[PDB]
Amino acid sequence: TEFKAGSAKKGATLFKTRCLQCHTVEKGGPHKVGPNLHGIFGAHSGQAEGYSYTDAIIKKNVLWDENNMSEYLTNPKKYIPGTKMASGGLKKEKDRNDLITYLKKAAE
Amino acid sequence: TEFKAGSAKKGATLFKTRCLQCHTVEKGGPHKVGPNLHGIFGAHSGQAEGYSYTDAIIKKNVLWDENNMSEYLTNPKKYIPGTKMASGGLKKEKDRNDLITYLKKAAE
Ligand code: HEC
Numbered sequence: 265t266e267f268k269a270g271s272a273k274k275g276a277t278l279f280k281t282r283c284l285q286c287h288t289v290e291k292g293g294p295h296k297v298g299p300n301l302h303g304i305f306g307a308h309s310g311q312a313e314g315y316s317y318t319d320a321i322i323k324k325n326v327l328w329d330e331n332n333m334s335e336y337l338t339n340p341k342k343y344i345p346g347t348k349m350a351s352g353g354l355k356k357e358k359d360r361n362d363l364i365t366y367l368k369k370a371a372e
Numbered sequence: 373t374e375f376k377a378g379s380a381k382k383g384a385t386l387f388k389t390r391c392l393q394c395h396t397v398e399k400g401g402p403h404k405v406g407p408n409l410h411g412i413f414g415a416h417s418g419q420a421e422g423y424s425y426t427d428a429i430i431k432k433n434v435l436w437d438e439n440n441m442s443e444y445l446t447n448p449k450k451y452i453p454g455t456k457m458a459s460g461g462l463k464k465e466k467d468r469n470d471l472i473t474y475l476k477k478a479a480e
Pocket residue numbers: 279282283284285286287297298299301304308309310311312316317318320321333337346347348349350351354363367
């Protein structure tokens with residue numbers, strides 16, 4: 265791809281410091297500011313049940329792959345204009361790689 | 373995405389007439405001219421065990437999503453120069469959509 269595996273250990277702590285405020289990843293984890301992310305890889309954007317997403321994220325209808333997820337994370341609003349995710353992005357590829365490595369694993 | 377679901381029924385018969393010559397899709401199906409495709413979505417190219425792939429397909433290291441799969445199928449050799457898949461492609465989007473719909477389903 266254009267995604268290279270990194271450190272899941274490193275990725276777990278980036279999740280905690282940059283995503284945990286708004287999201288859960290475990291199966292059976294609740295929706296918070298953002299939706300629970302269990303089973304996100306391979307899914308299309310805006311389909312978790314019982315979460316109120318923006319029109320923007322549903323219509324973009326992104327198919328979530330480690331690769332896709334990387335561009336999103338770099339700059340969420342530049343990737344999906346209209347998204348309400350108020351994350352300013354992970355600008356370093358090395359951070360994105362580690363985070364994705366972790367997510368790939370915990371969201372399964 | 374840029375993949376719209378189609379007819380799985382239609383997709384099953386396109387598979388039979390355009391892919392079955394070289395591939396199986398069922399779990400536990402054998403490798404033939406081409407590799408068994410069970411569990412291909414989400415996987416990277418050239419990783420089925422016990423299949424001898426080209427250098428080209430392993431190094432391209434494509435991450436298989438309905439979207440990716442679509443470009444491949446349009447023109448395999450233009451998408452992965454060096455691939456030994458001797459398919460000249462599915463030029464109509466409507467055929468690709470139906471086929472992918474089917475594959476999404478049977479490869480699971
Ligand atoms: C609150 C301040 C957030 C932080 C920090 C992060 N995310 Fe987020 N996320 C948030 C919202 C409000 C939403 C919904 C967007 C909308 O327009 O409706 C999202 C959405 C996602 C998604 C898409 C989910 C889907 O399609 O089901 C993903 C993949 C995602 N968020 C991941 C993610 C990661 C990995 C984060 C840390 C780097 C992160 N988000 C931060 C709110 C917030």
